[PDB]
Design a protein around this ligand. Structure first.
Ligand SMILES: CC[C@H](C)[C@H](N)C(=O)N[C@@H](CCCC[NH3+])C(=O)O
Ligand SMILES: [Ca+2]
Ligand SMILES: [Ca+2]
Ligand SMILES: [Ca+2]
Ligand SMILES: [Zn+2]
Length: 316
């Protein structure tokens, strides 16, 4: 909508107060004009018609329970835009400041979130498995990173390329969580998963097997469930990424960690310069080796650690 840029205040899903960029024209809308061609947040009103209505508020105060998922979807999309711009010199998901659109209150009791090819979509959860899923910065950044991947490598959402697609969303969703720096971790979705259970998450990058996901190529899923295991086999790549950043010894293979910034540069380069729609795990290793060689040199520690990490998870 056409109007003047404003600053509202509200509370997110976990009860934290934050300022949000709005636009005033009769109502205050969740329209952030400060980032690219805008960040726009919509109310799906418990239905599945998308996007729904651009979020309108009478007084620019967003403290209602019903407001919270919108506050977080809007705010965390801004954090994720800032990460890509500040850390990787990428302007929105398409690299040309595309508008970032999110809908909250999707369906009833919907225990998931997704990128639909055009926008982000967040369920409210059923209050047992999940609370509103935009409450997790790693969840928001994971979904927006699907848009980045779709515009760049274009990894097909099935089998190994799909598992890479999912791992890249977990890797950057985690790196965005560290960028914002509010008790960040290497776990996925801990802030919105199982409110009645302390300390768990949907997936773990540090130990995928904690939640039954494979942490070695020899344990890869080869059936048809989950588009050939895209959320399962991601654990093999998430473990490799965790080892490149943090180091460790896994199945007797030692990896020297090179830290999160270098992990992010190597994988952002692989995603944007080397991976293709059909890349498999072996081709990801080659892409990450070539990216680290470009950035640091063929005989660098960073290249050595990339090879060490893929060797540790059984990817040749
Ligand atoms: C990043 C977390 C987000 C929920 C994402 N869409 C996801 O990983 N979803 C998978 C896990 C199950 C979600 C709850 N039913 C999925 O299999 O869709
Ligand atoms: Ca209000
Ligand atoms: Ca996390
Ligand atoms: Ca929990
Ligand atoms: Zn995903």
């Amino acid at each position: 909508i056409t109007g003047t840029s404003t600053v509202g205040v509200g509370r997110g899903v976990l009860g934290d107060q934050k300022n949000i960029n709005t636009t005033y024209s009769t109502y205050y809308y969740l329209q952030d004009n400060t980032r690219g061609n805008g960040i726009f947040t919509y109310d799906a009103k418990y239905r599945t018609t998308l996007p729904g209505s651009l979020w309108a508020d009478a007084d620019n105060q967003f403290f209602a329970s019903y407001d919270a998922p919108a506050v977080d979807a809007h705010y965390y999309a801004g954090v994720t835009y800032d990460y890509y711009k500040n850390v990787h010199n990428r302007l929105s998901y398409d690299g040309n400041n595309a508008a970032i659109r999110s809908s909250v209150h999707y369906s009833q009791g919907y225990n998931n979130a997704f990128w639909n090819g055009s926008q982000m979509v967040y369920g409210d959860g059923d209050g047992q498995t999940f609370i509103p899923l935009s409450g997790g910065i790693d969840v928001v950044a994971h979904e927006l990173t699907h848009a980045v991947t779709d515009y760049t490598a274009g990894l097909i959402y099935q089998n190994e390329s799909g598992a890479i697609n999912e791992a890249i969303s977990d890797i950057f969703g985690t790196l965005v969580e560290f960028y914002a720096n509010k008790n960040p971790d290497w776990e996925i979705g801990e802030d919105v998963y199982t409110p009645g259970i302390s300390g768990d998450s949907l997936r773990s990058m540090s130990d995928p097997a904690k939640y039954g996901d494979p942490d070695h190529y020899s344990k890869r899923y080869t059936g048809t469930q989950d588009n050939g295991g895209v959320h399962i086999n991601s654990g093999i790549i998430n473990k490799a990424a965790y080892l490149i950043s943090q180091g460790g010894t896994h199945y007797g293979v030692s990896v020297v960690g090179i830290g999160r910034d270098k992990l992010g540069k190597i994988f952002y380069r692989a995603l944007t310069q080397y991976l293709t729609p059909t890349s498999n795990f072996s081709q990801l290793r080659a892409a990450a080796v070539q990216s680290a060689t470009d950035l640091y040199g063929s005989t660098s520690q960073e290249v050595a650690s990339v090879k060490q990490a893929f060797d540790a998870v059984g990817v040749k």
